[PDB]
Each structure stands twice: as C-alpha cells, then as structure tokens.
C-alpha cells in the first residue's frame, strides 16, 4: 500500500495544507509567481519590444513587465532547449522565453489550484461550489492568454505581464477591436459591477441588520463561531428594501447562490467575446449606421465619434507598437483634428 503511504503524508493537515494538488499547483504556481518577479526586475524585452522591462533598466513598478515575445516568434512554445535559444537561459531569456514559461506554468498552476479546492472540499466534505466558481477566472485567463494569441498572429499581441503592460492591452482592443461595443463584454462589465454591488449591498446589509447578541458597542464579540443561530433576522432586513428599493430577499440559501452567479456568470461572458477576438470576428461596426453616415455629412452619433478615437488610437499607436511590421507613417498621412 505504498500508494496510501505517499497519500497519508501529503494530505496530512499541516499549517498550510499540501496534498496531491500540491505536486502540481505548488511547483508551477511558483516558477510562475516566480518567473514573473525574476524578469520583473532583471530581464529586458528590448529584443522583441525594444522597450525597457526590468527595474534594473530603470523601469517603474507599473511600467515593468515580462513582455511577450517578438511577433517574429509565432506560437512556438519557446522552450529553453527548443530550436529557439537552442539551450541558453540568457538567450532564451532575451528571446522573451519566459512569458510562455510564465503563462503555461501559471496555466497548470491555475489547474492544480482548482483541483486543490476539489481535493479539500471532498476531504472536509463540502459542495464543490468553490472549485465550480473557479471556472470564472479559469476561462478568463485561458481566453485572454491562450486562445487569443493563438487565434491571432504571434504570442506577441498576447497580454504582457506588467500593469502598464495590460493597461496597454485595454486601449489595444479599444483601438483595433472596439471591445467596448461587444455585447458580451457588456455583460462582463455587467458581472463585475452587479457582483461588486452585491458583495457590498449584502455586505453592509448584514453589518446593519444584525442584533445585540453581545455586550459592548462593538460587534467583534457578538455571538459565534457557529453557536447562536444567525446574527441577522432576514425578516427585519427584508421589509426594509421591499419599501425602499421595492424588492428584497427571502432565503439566504439563494442569495448566496445568486451571489455565486452574477460574477462567475458574466465574467465567463466576455471570455466568449475574447474568443471572438482571436478571430478578429468582433463587434466593431453597425452597418445600418455606416450607410446612413456615408451619404450624410450631417449624420452624427457617439457611435461615429467614438469610432474615430479608434482610428486615432491606431494610426498614432501601431508603428512604434508593432515594430516587426515596419510601419512608415508620414506626418501628413497622420489623421488628427483641427488645431491639434
């Protein structure tokens, strides 16, 4: 029963639980949090983005990142030993080898971690609603770091690990994608919004409903942990909203569950949208308008205005942003308003 021997140890309730997941989650969920930090202050991506990455370069926390490989690369999983660096951490490094290293690990580390909840939820024995809810970020990442590049040109145009790095990515889509007009994303928004409201509507709705089941003028003493039954009478809270916002709850059994949906739900939504994006198959235009605009120098909606910003945020952007494709944009050709 050596199998059960290994087992026995691993899953032994330490301080920070290890277990089977651990042989996956932990290693990968390390070189990843890791590799990020390593390059974060040490490597430059001057060979793919002719920009400065590392703090060593003088970069700022925000402006630092482990920017994706040169689009000249493709989707090659830039192995250390692959025909790329041919074996040469230094080179492999300069070739922005790591970003594949940081994504795939973070990939499998994001795997091991959902499996990590499932392990526990099974051990302590509880509904798999944690791990189930982890689909949300699972999809999201996969969508924006794996399928997208894959569906586009190179790993290049894939997100790059840094904040000003991803801040880029937003305006990228706004530029050549007009993300803000894709129904789906408008649900992603929807989720992260409805959910942020719930997290708090219910959040401050509890703190301000509960009872005097303790002594002082403070609540951190009030009954618990699992003893006395329920701190907030959902009846005294109920009638408050059904007179204020019109419709209130009943059965926290669903409130919690409805709280599961909203976010994880919508999040997933955009992820689809994004898959639309790898295929440039996006929601950019509204023909009905283009034609109604074409023949009418007097027809104008925010639809159109916005649409321009896009052209701006692309003619000015692109050249210095997609170097591999040597863009030669003469000052004239350059679109830009009156007086600016």
């Amino acid at each position: 029963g050596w199998f059960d021997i290994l087992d026995d140890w691993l899953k032994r309730d330490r301080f920070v639980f290890v277990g089977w997941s651990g042989i996956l989650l932990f290693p990968c969920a390390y070189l990843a949090l890791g590799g990020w930090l390593t390059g974060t202050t040490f490597v430059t991506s001057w060979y793919t983005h002719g920009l400065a990455s590392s703090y060593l370069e003088g970069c700022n926390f925000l402006t630092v990142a482990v920017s994706t490989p040169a689009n000249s690369m493709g989707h090659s999983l830039l192995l250390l030993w692959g025909p790329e660096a041919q074996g040469d951490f230094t080179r492999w490094c300069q070739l922005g080898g790591l970003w594949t290293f940081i994504a795939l690990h973070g990939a499998f580390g994001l795997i091991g971690f959902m499996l990590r909840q499932f392990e526990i939820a099974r051990l302590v024995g509880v509904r798999p609603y944690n791990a189930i809810a982890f689909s949300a970020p699972i999809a999201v990442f996969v969508s924006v770091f794996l399928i997208y590049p894959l569906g586009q040109s190179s790993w290049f145009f894939a997100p790059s690990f840094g904040v000003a790095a991803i801040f880029r990515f937003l305006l990228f889509f706004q530029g050549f994608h007009n993300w803000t007009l894709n129904p789906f994303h408008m649900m992603g928004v929807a989720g992260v919004l409805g959910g942020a409201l719930l997290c708090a509507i219910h959040g401050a709705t509890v703190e301000n409903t509960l009872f005097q089941d303790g002594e002082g003028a403070s609540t951190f003493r009030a009954f618990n942990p699992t003893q006395a039954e329920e701190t907030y009478s959902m009846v005294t809270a109920n009638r408050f909203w059904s007179q204020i916002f019109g419709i209130a709850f009943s059965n926290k059994r669903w409130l919690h569950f409805f709280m599961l949906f909203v976010p994880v739900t919508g999040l997933w939504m955009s992820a689809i949208g994004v898959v639309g994006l790898a295929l440039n198959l996006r929601s950019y235009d509204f023909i009905s308008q283009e034609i109604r605009a074409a023949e009418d120098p007097e027809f104008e909606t925010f639809y159109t205005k916005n649409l321009l910003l896009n052209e701006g945020i692309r003619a000015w952007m692109a050249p210095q942003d997609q170097p591999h494709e040597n863009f030669v944009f003469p000052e004239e050709v350059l679109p830009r308003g009156n007086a600016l």
């Binding site: 005097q212 009846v235 005294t236 009638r239 009156n338 007086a339």
Partner: protein, 447 residues
C-alpha cells in the same frame, strides 16, 4: 483599564460620556498639532523659495497665503524680503511648542472628570445650556479673528490687491463695503455659471467690507448662545447626543471643504493668480489671447476671421450678444481678471482696443498663464496628459482643489456615519436590534 469595559480598539478612541479631561486636552492636543504644521511647513517653504521665481513654480501654498494679506508683497506680487514669512513660520513652531506643552497634560496627568475637580470647565452632553453657551463662546473667538483682517487691510497694511490701478500691489482698503444688500446679496443668489455663491467676488472691499459684517454677527452670536438656552422649537429634532454633536459640527466642514475647493479653483481675487496659479479658466483664455495677438500681428484681422467650424476663429458672440474668445475657450467667457479688463469693452471685448490698444505687457502675462495652466500629473509633471518629461510644475490651484475635495467628501460621508448612528443612541438600536423584540415582527406585513 479599557478595551474590556470600553467598547472597541480602532474605535478605542471616543471614550467620553458626560465629561473627560483626556479628550478636552486631546483637542487642545491636536488643535496644537495643527499649529505645528502651519509653522513647520512655513519654515519649510521659505527654506526654499528661489530669489525671484514664480511663487507657484515652487510647491508653495502657505507662503502664498501670507502674501495675500501683504507680507513680503512687492509692486506686482514680487517678494521684497524673505522675512515677513519667517515671522509667522517660527512664531508657529513656538506656537506649536505651546500647543504641545499642555495637551499631553490634559492627556496623561490632567484631571479626568470636569465635575469632580472644576465645576465650570465641566460639561455633560445632555447639558442643554452648558454646550449651548460654549458655542457663543468660540463663536466670539471667531468674531475676533473675523476682525483681524478688518484692521489688517484697514490698519496694519492692507491686503494685496491684484485689482489695483497700476497692477498688483498691496493697497490699504480704506472704504470697506458696508451696504447690507450688496454684502448680504452675495450669498443669497448666483449658483452656477452666471456667478458663484460667493466664489464670486469682484473687489477687495466687498470682502473686507463684509468680513466686517461677519466679525459682528458671530460676535453677537455668543451674546446669544452664551446668554440663552435653546428656544422652543429646535428642542425637537437634533439628537443632543455627544456623538451627534461631532456630526452637526462636522458635516458643515464637508460643505466648506467644497465651497473651498471651488474658491481655490475659480476666485482670482482672494487667490491672487500671482501668488498661486492661473485659474483653470484664466489659462484657457491666455491660450486664445496669445494666438490672437500672434495672429493679429502677422496681419490677420481677428474681428472678421471666420472659424473653421464656420463659427468664429478667434471671436464669437455669447448667448448675451457680448463678444468673447472662440475655439473651445468659449466655455470660459464668465472669467474676469486685471490683464484682460482694459482690453474689454461695453458689449464684451471691444474690436478697437483689442486691435491696437493691445499693450506690450499683457502679452507675456497672458502668455505665462498659457504655458503654466492648472494641469499636471499624479507624479509631478505639468503639461497635458502626454507631455514628454521636462516642465514639472503642478498648479497650486490644482493641489488645493484636489486636496480639499478628497477631504471635503469623506467628511460628508463622515456626517452620515455619526449623524445617523447617533440617531440610534437616542433610540437604543445602536448595537443592533433586540433578538426578542424586533419592531418589524409587530407590523401588519404589507405582503
């Protein structure tokens, strides 16, 4: 001995029922700290101001305040001697030391109760008049300062008037405006674009002449609160709770941190553009101003030049039929100031004086305000959103506007915090409801 009988930790602070000599000497404690900053930062501002360089190109916000009264002034706004400044700065650090000296006192060896020891420097919040009285008292301490300006602009060296005949120069306000309707009319109307509640002040005497109407009212308030107990109506309403008082006296500041944040931003007078920055609108005008001269000199005829939008390239009418600067600069037609006024006519800008009368100095002054406009960056770097790294001044009018809001807001929400929970003490809900007696369980459920 608290934390167990006392309610909480973070909220540990607040212990105060009927009285407390620790909390008294705690406001005298902080009300002293505040004094410390006044001076320390002052001695940190003079410790810097280059011989002669824009007062706003250097991060000065206190020094500029001292200037408005007429200290270090100079014809035009140019500091004469780096001294009047150092006086208030150190007199504040020594003021600060004084604040320090007896606050820690009431705080550690100072007598607890204000009933056991003293019987006059002793309160109780339910004490309807004790509180009522102290009111008219600090009201009087304000009726006093409310006069400092009155004799400072009228007796010890008037206020710097950038609305002076020859230019910016500390003049001595001898004729304060004491016309009941004009000084009481200011607050009583004008909210938006038309004009500001009171951020709308033209001359330096409507202020001094009014800061006179204020030094009495509040002064005559004490002879009213110190002299009388609450009336017959206000008894009701008002939760004379201890906490509640923090709120009633608190959410007022939120109002002022706002009516302040708008003063540093718009008011040119009390906010001499020479000591602080050039009001957001002002800069926008200097923009057109410049390029209008630039272009007029190159032979263009501004009067007739038709915009590209077809509107008016340099000049266009206002919904009042007045004349005003075009471009986008239109939004700011209500703006007024000394460098422009002479180049202004009866129906707004005057096509004539604008053509030749365009004297040589107004060019650079209206040029400075362009270059240095109220816009900067989170990490200092004056210029538009995407300006390379070179200039790095961030308008004071910008910091004072940003600052005061952030605070002015939290306060409003701070008004809520207490004004509504204190409405839970006089009701006993504060701490939640009674697990057996819940008022919604004894109600004909609407459904």
């Amino acid at each position: 001995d608290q934390e167990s009988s006392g309610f909480a930790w973070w909220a540990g602070n607040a212990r105060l029922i009927n009285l407390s000599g620790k909390l008294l000497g705690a406001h005298v404690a902080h009300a002293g700290l505040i004094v410390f900053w006044a001076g320390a930062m002052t001695l940190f501002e003079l410790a810097h101001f280059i011989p002669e360089k824009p007062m706003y190109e250097q991060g000065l916000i206190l020094i500029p305040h001292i200037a408005t009264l007429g200290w270090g002034v100079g014809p035009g706004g140019e500091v004469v001697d780096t001294f009047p400044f150092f006086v208030v700065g150190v007199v504040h650090l020594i003021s600060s030391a004084v604040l320090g000296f007896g606050g820690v006192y009431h705080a550690i060896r100072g007598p607890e109760t204000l009933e056991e020891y003293s019987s006059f420097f002793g309160y109780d919040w339910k004490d309807k008049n004790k509180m009522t009285t102290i009111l008219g008292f600090h009201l009087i301490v304000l009726g006093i300062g409310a006069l400092l300006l009155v004799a400072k602009a009228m007796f010890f060296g008037g206020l710097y008037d950038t609305w002076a005949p020859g230019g910016g120069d500390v003049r001595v306000i001898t004729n304060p405006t004491l016309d009941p309707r004009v000084i009481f009319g200011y607050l009583l109307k004008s909210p938006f674009g038309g004009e500001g509640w009171i951020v709308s002040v033209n001359n330096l005497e409507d202020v001094v002449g009014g800061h006179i109407w204020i030094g009495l009212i509040c002064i005559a308030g004490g002879i009213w609160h110190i002299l009388t107990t609450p009336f017959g109506w206000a008894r009701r309403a008002f939760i004379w709770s201890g906490e509640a008082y923090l709120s009633y006296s608190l959410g007022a500041l939120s109002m002022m941190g706002f009516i302040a944040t708008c003063f540093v931003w718009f008011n040119n007078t009390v906010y001499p553009s020479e000591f602080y920055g050039p009001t957001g609108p002002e800069a926008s005008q200097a923009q057109a101003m410049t390029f209008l001269i630039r272009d007029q000199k190159l032979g263009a005829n501004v009067g007739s030049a038709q915009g590209p939008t077809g509107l008016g390239k340099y000049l266009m009418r206002s919904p009042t039929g007045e004349i005003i600067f075009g471009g986008e600069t239109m939004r700011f037609w209500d703006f007024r100031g000394p460098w422009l006024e002479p180049l202004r006519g009866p129906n707004g800008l005057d096509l004539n004086k604008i053509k030749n009368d365009i004297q040589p100095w107004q060019e650079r002054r209206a040029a400075e305000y362009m270059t240095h406009a109220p816009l900067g960056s989170l990490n200092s770097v004056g210029g538009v959103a995407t300006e390379i790294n070179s200039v790095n001044f961030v308008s004071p009018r910008s910091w004072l506007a940003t600052s005061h809001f952030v605070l002015a807001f939290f306060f409003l929400v701070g008004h809520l915090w207490h004004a509504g929970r204190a409405r839970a003490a006089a009701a006993g809900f504060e701490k939640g409801i009674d697990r057996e007696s819940e008022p919604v369980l004894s109600m004909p459920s609407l459904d």
